[PDB]
Coordinates of C-alpha atoms in Angstrom, one line a residue:
Chain A
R50 CA -10.4 19.3 30.1
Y51 CA -6.6 18.5 29.6
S52 CA -4.5 17.9 32.9
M53 CA -1.8 20.6 34.3
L54 CA -3.5 23.0 32.0
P55 CA -6.5 25.6 32.4
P56 CA -9.8 23.6 30.7
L57 CA -10.5 24.9 27.4
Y58 CA -14.1 25.5 25.9
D59 CA -16.1 24.6 23.0
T60 CA -13.8 24.2 20.0
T61 CA -10.0 23.4 19.4
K62 CA -7.8 21.6 17.5
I63 CA -5.8 18.3 18.1
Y64 CA -2.5 17.8 15.5
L65 CA -1.6 14.2 14.7
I66 CA 1.6 15.2 12.8
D67 CA 3.9 12.2 11.8
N68 CA 6.9 14.5 13.1
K69 CA 6.1 13.7 16.8
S70 CA 6.3 10.2 16.2
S71 CA 10.0 10.0 15.4
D72 CA 10.3 11.5 18.9
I73 CA 8.4 8.2 20.8
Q74 CA 11.0 6.1 18.4
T75 CA 10.8 3.5 21.3
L76 CA 6.9 2.6 20.6
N77 CA 7.7 2.9 16.1
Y78 CA 10.6 0.2 16.0
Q79 CA 8.3 -2.0 13.2
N80 CA 5.8 0.9 12.4
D81 CA 6.6 2.3 8.9
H82 CA 5.4 6.0 7.7
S83 CA 1.4 4.6 7.4
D84 CA 0.8 2.4 10.5
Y85 CA 2.6 4.9 13.5
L86 CA 2.1 6.4 16.9
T87 CA 2.0 9.3 17.8
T88 CA 1.2 11.7 21.0
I89 CA -1.7 14.2 20.6
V90 CA -0.1 16.2 23.5
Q91 CA 2.2 18.8 22.4
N92 CA 3.8 21.1 25.6
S93 CA 7.7 21.5 25.9
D94 CA 7.5 20.6 29.6
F95 CA 7.1 17.0 29.3
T96 CA 9.5 15.1 26.6
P97 CA 7.1 13.8 24.1
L98 CA 7.3 10.3 25.6
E99 CA 6.3 11.3 28.9
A100 CA 3.4 14.2 27.7
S101 CA 2.7 10.8 25.8
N102 CA 1.2 9.9 29.2
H103 CA -1.5 12.4 29.9
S104 CA -4.9 12.3 28.2
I105 CA -7.7 15.0 26.9
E106 CA -10.7 14.6 28.6
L107 CA -13.7 15.5 26.2
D108 CA -16.7 15.9 28.7
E109 CA -18.8 13.3 29.4
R110 CA -22.0 15.1 29.2
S111 CA -21.7 15.7 25.5
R112 CA -21.4 13.1 22.7
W113 CA -18.3 14.9 21.1
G114 CA -18.3 15.0 17.6
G115 CA -15.4 16.1 15.7
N116 CA -14.8 17.3 11.9
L117 CA -11.1 15.6 10.4
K118 CA -8.9 17.4 7.9
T119 CA -6.1 14.8 6.3
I120 CA -2.9 15.9 4.6
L121 CA -1.4 12.9 2.9
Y122 CA 1.3 12.8 -0.1
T123 CA 2.2 9.3 -0.7
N124 CA 5.2 8.7 -2.9
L125 CA 3.6 5.6 -5.0
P126 CA 5.1 3.8 -8.3
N127 CA 3.1 3.0 -10.9
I128 CA 4.3 -0.5 -11.2
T129 CA 4.8 -2.5 -8.0
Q130 CA 4.3 -5.9 -5.9
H131 CA 2.2 -4.3 -3.8
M132 CA -1.1 -3.2 -6.0
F133 CA -0.4 -6.4 -8.2
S134 CA 0.8 -4.1 -10.9
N135 CA 3.7 -6.4 -11.9
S136 CA 2.5 -10.1 -12.1
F137 CA 1.7 -11.1 -15.7
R138 CA 1.0 -14.6 -17.1
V139 CA 1.4 -16.5 -20.5
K140 CA 0.0 -19.8 -21.7
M141 CA 2.7 -21.2 -23.6
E153 CA 2.5 -23.9 -20.0
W154 CA 1.2 -21.4 -17.9
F155 CA 4.6 -19.4 -17.4
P156 CA 4.3 -16.6 -15.0
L157 CA 5.8 -13.2 -15.7
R158 CA 6.9 -10.4 -13.6
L159 CA 8.0 -6.8 -14.8
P160 CA 10.9 -4.4 -12.7
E161 CA 9.1 -1.9 -10.4
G162 CA 9.4 1.6 -10.6
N163 CA 7.4 4.5 -12.3
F164 CA 7.0 3.9 -16.2
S165 CA 4.6 5.8 -18.9
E166 CA 2.3 3.6 -20.9
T167 CA 4.6 3.1 -23.7
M168 CA 7.3 2.0 -21.6
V169 CA 4.9 -0.4 -19.2
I170 CA 4.2 -2.4 -22.7
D171 CA 7.7 -2.2 -23.6
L172 CA 8.8 -4.1 -20.4
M173 CA 5.7 -6.3 -21.4
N174 CA 7.2 -7.4 -24.5
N175 CA 10.6 -7.5 -23.5
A176 CA 9.9 -9.5 -20.5
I177 CA 7.8 -12.2 -22.9
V178 CA 11.3 -12.4 -25.2
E179 CA 13.4 -12.9 -22.1
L180 CA 11.0 -15.6 -20.7
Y181 CA 11.2 -17.0 -24.1
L182 CA 14.7 -16.7 -24.1
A183 CA 14.9 -18.5 -21.5
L184 CA 14.1 -22.6 -21.9
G185 CA 11.2 -21.8 -24.0
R186 CA 13.6 -21.8 -27.4
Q187 CA 15.8 -24.7 -25.8
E188 CA 13.4 -26.8 -26.2
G189 CA 13.0 -26.9 -30.2
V190 CA 10.9 -23.7 -30.4
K191 CA 11.4 -21.9 -33.5
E192 CA 12.6 -18.0 -32.3
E193 CA 9.1 -16.3 -34.6
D194 CA 6.5 -18.9 -33.7
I195 CA 6.0 -16.6 -30.0
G196 CA 2.2 -15.9 -30.0
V197 CA 2.2 -13.2 -27.7
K198 CA 2.2 -9.7 -28.6
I199 CA 1.1 -5.9 -27.5
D200 CA 0.6 -3.9 -30.4
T201 CA -0.8 -0.1 -30.2
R202 CA -1.7 -0.9 -34.0
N203 CA -5.1 -0.8 -36.2
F204 CA -4.3 -4.1 -38.6
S205 CA -7.2 -2.6 -40.8
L206 CA -5.9 0.9 -42.0
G207 CA -5.7 0.8 -46.0
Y208 CA -7.5 -2.5 -46.6
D209 CA -9.0 -2.7 -49.9
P210 CA -11.7 -5.3 -50.0
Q211 CA -11.4 -6.1 -53.9
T212 CA -8.0 -7.1 -53.2
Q213 CA -8.4 -8.7 -49.8
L214 CA -5.0 -7.2 -48.5
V215 CA -3.7 -3.9 -47.2
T216 CA -2.1 -1.8 -50.3
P217 CA 0.9 -0.3 -48.6
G218 CA 3.3 -3.0 -47.8
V219 CA 3.6 -1.8 -44.1
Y220 CA 1.2 -1.9 -41.5
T221 CA 0.0 1.8 -40.6
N222 CA 2.4 3.2 -37.6
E223 CA -0.6 4.8 -35.6
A224 CA -1.2 4.8 -32.1
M225 CA -5.3 3.8 -31.8
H226 CA -5.5 1.5 -28.6
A227 CA -3.4 -1.2 -27.2
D228 CA -4.3 -4.8 -28.1
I229 CA -3.2 -7.9 -27.6
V230 CA -1.8 -10.6 -30.6
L231 CA -2.6 -13.9 -30.3
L232 CA -1.2 -16.9 -32.7
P233 CA -3.2 -20.4 -32.6
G234 CA -1.8 -22.2 -29.3
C235 CA -0.2 -19.8 -26.8
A236 CA -2.3 -16.9 -25.0
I237 CA -2.4 -14.5 -21.9
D238 CA -4.4 -14.8 -19.4
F239 CA -4.1 -12.8 -16.2
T240 CA -6.6 -12.2 -13.4
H241 CA -4.6 -11.2 -10.4
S242 CA -2.9 -8.2 -11.9
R243 CA -4.1 -5.0 -12.9
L244 CA -1.9 -4.7 -16.2
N245 CA -5.6 -4.9 -18.0
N246 CA -6.3 -1.2 -16.5
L247 CA -3.1 0.3 -18.0
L248 CA -3.0 -1.0 -21.4
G249 CA -7.0 -0.7 -21.4
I250 CA -9.1 -4.0 -21.7
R251 CA -12.0 -4.6 -19.4
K252 CA -14.2 -7.4 -18.5
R253 CA -17.7 -6.7 -19.9
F254 CA -18.8 -8.9 -17.2
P255 CA -16.4 -8.5 -14.2
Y256 CA -16.9 -10.7 -11.0
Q257 CA -16.9 -14.0 -12.3
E258 CA -14.2 -15.8 -12.7
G259 CA -11.2 -13.4 -14.1
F260 CA -10.0 -12.0 -17.0
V261 CA -8.7 -15.3 -19.4
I262 CA -9.2 -13.8 -22.8
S263 CA -7.3 -16.3 -25.3
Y264 CA -7.5 -17.7 -28.9
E265 CA -10.1 -19.3 -30.5
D266 CA -12.2 -16.2 -28.1
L267 CA -10.9 -13.6 -30.7
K268 CA -12.3 -15.3 -33.5
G269 CA -13.3 -12.8 -36.5
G270 CA -10.3 -10.3 -36.4
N271 CA -7.6 -12.5 -37.7
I272 CA -4.7 -9.9 -39.3
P273 CA -5.2 -9.5 -43.2
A274 CA -2.5 -10.2 -44.7
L275 CA -0.2 -7.9 -46.4
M276 CA 1.1 -7.6 -50.8
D277 CA 4.8 -7.3 -51.8
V278 CA 5.8 -4.1 -52.9
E279 CA 8.8 -4.9 -54.7
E280 CA 6.8 -7.9 -56.4
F281 CA 3.8 -5.5 -57.5
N282 CA 6.6 -2.4 -58.9
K283 CA 8.3 -5.3 -60.9
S284 CA 5.3 -7.5 -62.4
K285 CA 2.2 -6.0 -61.2
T286 CA 1.2 -8.9 -59.2
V287 CA -0.6 -9.2 -55.7
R288 CA 0.1 -11.6 -53.3
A289 CA 0.6 -12.4 -49.4
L290 CA 4.0 -11.7 -47.3
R291 CA 4.4 -15.3 -46.9
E292 CA 7.9 -14.8 -45.5
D293 CA 10.1 -11.8 -43.9
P294 CA 12.9 -10.9 -45.6
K295 CA 15.2 -11.9 -42.4
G296 CA 13.4 -15.9 -42.5
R297 CA 10.5 -15.4 -40.2
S298 CA 7.2 -17.1 -41.7
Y299 CA 3.8 -14.8 -41.5
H300 CA 1.6 -18.0 -40.6
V301 CA -0.7 -16.3 -44.2
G302 CA -2.1 -20.1 -44.8
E303 CA -2.4 -21.0 -41.2
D304 CA -5.4 -20.9 -39.0
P305 CA -8.0 -22.6 -40.3
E306 CA -12.0 -21.5 -41.1
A307 CA -10.2 -18.3 -42.0
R308 CA -9.4 -17.3 -45.1
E309 CA -6.1 -18.1 -46.6
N310 CA -5.7 -13.8 -47.4
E311 CA -5.3 -13.5 -43.1
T312 CA -2.4 -14.6 -40.7
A313 CA -3.0 -16.6 -37.9
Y314 CA -2.5 -13.8 -35.4
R315 CA -5.7 -12.6 -33.9
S316 CA -5.6 -9.1 -33.2
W317 CA -8.0 -8.1 -30.2
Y318 CA -8.4 -5.0 -31.6
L319 CA -10.1 -5.5 -35.1
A320 CA -11.6 -8.6 -32.9
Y321 CA -13.5 -6.1 -30.8
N322 CA -14.4 -4.2 -34.2
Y323 CA -15.2 -5.8 -37.8
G324 CA -16.4 -8.7 -36.0
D325 CA -20.2 -10.3 -34.3
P326 CA -20.8 -8.2 -31.3
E327 CA -23.1 -10.4 -29.8
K328 CA -20.7 -13.8 -30.3
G329 CA -17.4 -12.2 -30.6
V330 CA -14.9 -10.5 -27.7
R331 CA -17.0 -7.5 -28.0
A332 CA -19.5 -9.3 -25.5
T333 CA -17.0 -10.2 -23.4
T334 CA -14.5 -7.0 -23.0
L335 CA -14.9 -3.2 -23.8
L336 CA -12.4 -1.0 -24.6
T337 CA -11.1 1.7 -21.8
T338 CA -9.1 4.6 -21.7
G339 CA -5.5 3.1 -20.6
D340 CA -5.3 4.5 -17.1
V341 CA -1.5 3.9 -16.2
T342 CA -2.0 3.5 -12.4
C343 CA -3.6 0.5 -12.8
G344 CA -6.7 1.6 -11.9
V345 CA -7.2 4.6 -9.5
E346 CA -8.1 3.1 -5.7
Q347 CA -8.7 4.8 -2.6
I348 CA -7.0 4.8 0.9
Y349 CA -9.1 3.4 4.0
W350 CA -8.1 6.3 6.9
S351 CA -8.3 4.1 10.1
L352 CA -7.8 5.4 13.5
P353 CA -8.7 3.1 16.4
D354 CA -8.6 5.6 19.4
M355 CA -10.7 9.4 19.3
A356 CA -13.0 8.2 16.6
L357 CA -15.9 6.1 17.7
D358 CA -16.5 2.9 15.5
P359 CA -18.8 3.6 12.6
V360 CA -22.0 1.9 12.3
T361 CA -21.3 -1.7 11.8
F362 CA -17.4 -1.8 11.9
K363 CA -15.5 -3.9 14.9
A364 CA -11.8 -3.8 15.6
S365 CA -9.8 -6.8 14.4
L366 CA -7.2 -8.5 15.3
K367 CA -4.9 -7.5 11.8
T368 CA -2.9 -4.5 11.9
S369 CA -4.9 -3.7 8.8
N370 CA -8.4 -4.2 9.3
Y371 CA -9.2 -1.2 11.8
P372 CA -11.9 0.3 12.0
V373 CA -12.1 3.1 9.0
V374 CA -12.7 6.6 10.2
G375 CA -12.5 8.1 6.0
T376 CA -11.8 7.3 2.9
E377 CA -10.3 9.4 0.5
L378 CA -8.8 8.6 -3.8
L379 CA -5.6 7.6 -4.2
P380 CA -2.9 10.4 -4.9
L381 CA -2.3 8.9 -8.1
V382 CA -3.6 11.5 -10.7
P383 CA -3.1 10.4 -14.9
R384 CA -1.9 13.6 -16.1
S385 CA -2.5 13.2 -20.3
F386 CA 0.3 14.7 -22.2
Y387 CA 0.0 15.3 -26.3
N388 CA 3.2 14.9 -28.4
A389 CA 2.2 14.9 -32.2
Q390 CA 5.4 13.4 -33.1
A391 CA 5.5 10.4 -31.0
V392 CA 6.6 8.3 -33.2
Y393 CA 9.5 10.2 -33.9
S394 CA 10.0 10.9 -30.5
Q395 CA 10.4 7.0 -30.3
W396 CA 12.9 7.2 -33.3
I397 CA 15.1 8.9 -30.9
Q398 CA 14.9 6.9 -27.9
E399 CA 15.5 3.7 -29.6
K400 CA 18.3 5.8 -31.3
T401 CA 19.9 7.2 -28.2
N402 CA 19.4 3.6 -26.2
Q403 CA 22.1 2.5 -27.9
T404 CA 21.0 -1.2 -27.5
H405 CA 18.1 -3.5 -29.4
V406 CA 16.7 -4.7 -26.4
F407 CA 13.1 -3.2 -26.6
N408 CA 12.9 -3.6 -30.0
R409 CA 14.4 -7.4 -31.2
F410 CA 12.8 -7.4 -34.5
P411 CA 12.5 -4.4 -36.5
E412 CA 11.9 -5.9 -39.2
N413 CA 8.8 -7.9 -38.9
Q414 CA 6.1 -6.5 -39.7
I415 CA 4.2 -7.9 -36.7
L416 CA 6.8 -8.1 -34.5
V417 CA 7.9 -5.3 -34.7
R418 CA 8.3 -2.7 -31.3
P419 CA 5.0 -0.7 -31.2
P420 CA 4.5 2.9 -31.8
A421 CA 4.6 5.0 -28.6
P422 CA 0.8 6.1 -28.4
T423 CA 0.3 10.1 -29.6
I424 CA -1.2 10.3 -26.2
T425 CA 0.9 9.8 -23.2
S426 CA -0.4 9.9 -19.7
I427 CA 2.3 9.3 -17.4
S428 CA 1.2 9.3 -13.4
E429 CA 2.2 11.6 -10.8
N430 CA 2.0 11.9 -7.5
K431 CA 0.6 14.8 -5.9
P432 CA -0.4 16.1 -2.0
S433 CA -4.4 16.0 -1.2
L434 CA -6.0 18.2 1.3
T435 CA -9.4 16.7 2.2
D436 CA -12.6 17.1 4.6
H437 CA -14.1 13.9 5.8
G438 CA -17.2 16.1 7.8
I439 CA -18.3 15.2 11.2
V440 CA -16.4 12.0 13.0
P441 CA -17.8 10.8 16.4
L442 CA -15.1 11.0 19.2
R443 CA -14.5 9.5 22.7
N444 CA -14.1 11.1 25.9
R445 CA -11.3 9.9 27.2
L446 CA -8.7 10.8 24.3
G447 CA -5.2 8.9 25.0
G448 CA -2.1 10.1 24.7
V449 CA 0.0 8.1 22.3
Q450 CA -2.5 6.8 19.0
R451 CA -2.3 4.6 16.2
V452 CA -2.7 6.0 12.8
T453 CA -3.0 3.4 10.0
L454 CA -3.7 3.7 5.8
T455 CA -4.7 0.8 4.6
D456 CA -5.4 -0.3 1.2
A457 CA -8.9 -0.9 -0.5
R458 CA -8.2 -4.6 0.5
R459 CA -6.7 -3.5 4.4
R460 CA -3.3 -4.6 2.9
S461 CA -1.7 -1.4 5.0
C462 CA -0.1 -0.2 2.0
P463 CA 3.3 1.2 3.2
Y464 CA 4.2 3.9 0.4
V465 CA 2.6 6.2 2.4
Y466 CA 4.1 9.6 3.0
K467 CA 3.5 12.5 5.5
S468 CA 0.2 11.4 6.2
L469 CA -1.0 14.6 8.6
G470 CA -4.7 14.4 10.4
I471 CA -6.5 17.4 12.2
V472 CA -9.3 16.8 14.0
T473 CA -11.8 19.9 15.3
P474 CA -13.9 18.5 18.5
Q475 CA -17.7 19.8 18.7
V476 CA -20.5 19.0 20.9
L477 CA -23.2 17.0 19.5
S478 CA -26.2 15.8 21.3
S479 CA -25.8 15.5 25.5
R480 CA -25.6 13.0 27.7
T481 CA -22.9 9.5 27.7
Chain B
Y305 CA 3.1 -7.9 26.1
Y306 CA 2.3 -5.9 29.3
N307 CA 2.7 -2.1 28.5
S308 CA 3.9 -1.5 24.6
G309 CA 1.6 1.0 22.5
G310 CA 0.9 -1.6 19.7
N311 CA -0.5 -4.6 21.6
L312 CA -3.4 -4.2 24.1
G313 CA -5.7 -6.2 26.3
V314 CA -9.0 -5.3 24.5
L315 CA -11.0 -6.8 27.5
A316 CA -14.5 -5.4 26.9
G317 CA -17.7 -6.1 27.1
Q318 CA -20.5 -7.0 24.3
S319 CA -22.3 -3.7 24.1
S320 CA -19.5 -1.2 25.8
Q321 CA -17.1 -2.1 23.1
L322 CA -14.7 0.2 25.1
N323 CA -11.5 -1.0 26.4
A324 CA -11.1 -1.9 29.5
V325 CA -7.3 -2.3 30.0
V326 CA -5.1 0.9 29.7
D327 CA -1.2 0.4 29.5
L328 CA 0.7 3.5 29.4
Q329 CA 5.0 3.2 29.4
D330 CA 5.3 3.2 32.9
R331 CA 3.5 0.6 34.4
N332 CA 6.2 -1.8 34.9
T333 CA 3.3 -4.5 36.0
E334 CA 5.9 -7.3 35.4
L335 CA 8.3 -6.6 38.2
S336 CA 4.8 -5.4 40.5
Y337 CA 3.5 -8.9 39.9
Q338 CA 7.5 -9.8 41.1
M339 CA 7.1 -7.6 44.5
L340 CA 3.7 -8.8 44.9
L341 CA 4.5 -12.5 45.2
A342 CA 8.0 -11.7 47.3
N343 CA 6.1 -9.8 49.9
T344 CA 2.6 -12.4 49.9
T345 CA 4.4 -15.5 49.8
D346 CA 7.4 -17.1 50.2
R347 CA 9.6 -17.3 47.3
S348 CA 12.5 -20.1 48.3
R349 CA 9.8 -22.8 47.4
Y350 CA 9.4 -23.5 43.8
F351 CA 6.0 -23.8 42.6
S352 CA 5.8 -25.7 39.6
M353 CA 2.9 -24.8 37.9
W354 CA 3.7 -21.3 37.2
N355 CA 7.1 -21.0 37.1
Chain C
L609 CA 4.9 -1.2 43.3
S610 CA 2.4 1.8 42.6
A611 CA 4.7 3.9 40.9
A612 CA 5.9 5.8 37.6
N613 CA 9.0 4.0 36.3
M614 CA 11.1 6.2 34.6
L615 CA 14.8 5.5 33.1
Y616 CA 17.5 8.0 32.8
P617 CA 20.7 7.1 30.5
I618 CA 24.2 7.7 32.1
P619 CA 27.4 8.3 30.4
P620 CA 29.7 5.9 32.0
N621 CA 31.1 8.8 34.4
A622 CA 30.0 11.6 37.0
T623 CA 26.3 12.7 37.8
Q624 CA 22.6 13.5 36.4
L625 CA 19.9 15.7 36.8
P626 CA 16.2 15.0 36.1
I627 CA 12.4 16.1 35.7
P628 CA 10.3 19.6 35.0
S629 CA 7.6 20.6 36.8
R630 CA 4.2 18.7 37.7
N631 CA 1.5 18.4 40.4
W632 CA 2.8 16.2 43.6
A633 CA -0.4 15.4 45.2
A634 CA -0.5 11.9 47.0
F635 CA 3.2 11.8 46.5
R636 CA 4.3 8.5 48.5
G637 CA 8.5 8.4 47.6
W638 CA 11.4 7.8 45.5
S639 CA 13.1 4.4 44.5
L640 CA 16.4 4.3 42.9
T641 CA 18.6 1.5 41.1
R642 CA 20.9 1.7 38.6
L643 CA 20.5 -0.8 35.9
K644 CA 22.8 -1.3 32.4
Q645 CA 21.7 -0.2 29.4
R646 CA 22.8 -3.5 27.3
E647 CA 20.7 -5.4 29.7
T648 CA 17.6 -2.9 29.9
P649 CA 14.7 -3.8 26.8
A650 CA 12.4 -1.5 25.5
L651 CA 9.1 -2.7 25.7
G652 CA 7.4 -0.6 24.1
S653 CA 7.5 -2.3 20.4
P654 CA 6.4 -5.2 19.5
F655 CA 10.3 -6.2 18.5
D656 CA 13.8 -5.0 20.2
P657 CA 16.5 -5.3 17.3
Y658 CA 18.9 -3.9 19.7
Chain D
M862 CA 17.7 15.8 41.9
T863 CA 21.2 15.4 41.0
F864 CA 23.1 12.1 41.7
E865 CA 26.4 10.8 42.2
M866 CA 27.4 7.8 41.4
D867 CA 30.5 5.2 41.3
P868 CA 31.7 5.3 37.7
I869 CA 32.0 2.2 36.2
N870 CA 32.5 1.4 31.9
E871 CA 29.9 0.3 30.6
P872 CA 27.0 2.6 29.5
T873 CA 24.7 2.0 31.8
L874 CA 20.9 4.0 33.3
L875 CA 19.0 5.4 36.0
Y876 CA 15.9 3.3 37.2
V877 CA 14.6 5.8 39.9
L878 CA 10.4 5.4 39.9
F879 CA 8.5 7.2 41.8
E880 CA 6.4 6.1 44.2
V881 CA 2.6 7.2 43.2
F882 CA -1.1 6.4 43.8
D883 CA -2.2 4.1 41.2
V884 CA -5.6 2.8 41.8
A885 CA -8.6 1.5 38.9
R886 CA -12.4 0.6 40.6
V887 CA -14.1 -1.0 38.1
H888 CA -17.9 -0.3 37.7
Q889 CA -20.0 -3.3 36.1
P890 CA -23.7 -1.6 35.2
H891 CA -25.6 -4.3 33.6
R892 CA -25.1 -7.2 31.7
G893 CA -22.2 -7.0 29.4
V894 CA -21.1 -3.7 30.6
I895 CA -17.5 -3.0 32.2
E896 CA -15.9 0.3 33.0
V897 CA -12.4 0.6 34.4
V898 CA -11.6 4.3 35.3
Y899 CA -8.1 4.8 36.3
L900 CA -5.9 7.4 37.8
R901 CA -2.2 7.9 38.8
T902 CA -2.2 11.2 40.8
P903 CA 1.0 12.7 41.0
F904 CA 1.9 11.9 37.3
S905 CA -1.2 12.2 35.6
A906 CA -2.9 9.5 33.8
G907 CA -6.2 7.3 33.2

């Protein structure tokens, strides 16, 4: 039964269009595109604000259910402060880092991380008297083991193989990175084997057994048939070949989480603490708790709280952040072309250092994308006095009222369930 | 707040869990209280416990 | 004041014409008075920036 | 309705209010159940 109209029977359709919320702007001054107010009553005879007064009264002799259909398409950027996708922490101490917001690919985010680390080094990190090659943090998507001849205890080529493999964490004694409140591990690829405990605080002295093997002098080999490690970068940067005691002198001081996950003790090394994960640039796919205080009866063991985000949840669906993977065989060549066209060396400030070089772009690029999603949430119990003004709220998995939601549309089809009340 | 959609008097029983207060954009309950006082009692005398 | 207050804006001249259809049962009467747009706030929102 | 008014410079608004029957009866069945039914008779509500 709707007032001033003949009653309808059995089923019907109720549209919670967000475009109608723009006709009652007086009620939505402080409401974003995810926590707005709309009106069910759609008749041209009244202005929308006045039609919001009327209410649709389903019969009180039956417990009215409802099939809820949803159209959702949020334009969420990949790296945000809202999703904790840009926070970072580097020890040498305990300097936090921040990345610029925006939609970026995996290699772009890795480059931004390296650039932020270098910028923080340039900001008060070098004025105190730290020599520039003493930076102890690097993210190089490389495997520092290809062509490593055990008999000579060195990698035979004079250049580390510039392949993709998997992103890792390169740590020098002392400085280390320990991020717990950020989700950058999801995109670069690393996860705790035993989460929920304290956080993700992998550091030096943890990656024992994976020290980067040194590399031999190609020029000196071709000159005198002698084999020895690169103790000095041609530009004047030590490779810390002789440092890191308890490890043989043919390995540098860098730790290289990858080549420490592998080729190491599994029950005692970083293997027992962290595991490899495919790089999900979306920082881990989340879900949106569809919440609607008015028509839907409170589901089991939920109460309406004060928080504008902690409303009872009527339904849930996956966040429309689907990481689609692209394959480019000449990814390194494309990266070189991009570096040339950038006309600046900000993303590659040490092109000559074999360890501090800009990490190669992975051959599997998995940039995120935003797509509309239509889902059916099944039968939802309703009330018998569905009002005109209704609140429609979409919240994060932590009930944080995500504000990037765009064009959230819900369709409800009432049905008769049971009887009485 | 009295007639804002976002803010409501959700006064209700423990078992019903259904709002017993509805306000819809039109009931000027503030002017209602003003007229109620001005009619029931004389308002030339100031009561200090309210305004 | 059992009533239903409706406010209709007035450009600074002339006349105006309100209201579509309805029912009109138990109607009691009208009460009309002009206010200023600057003075009248918007009560439908938690905050009124204007 | 048509209103003819003395014109003033600053923009203004009309505040015609329709005197209606706005009543509500509260029913309290048992030990923590409170149900209120509203009724605005000319202008449909509740």
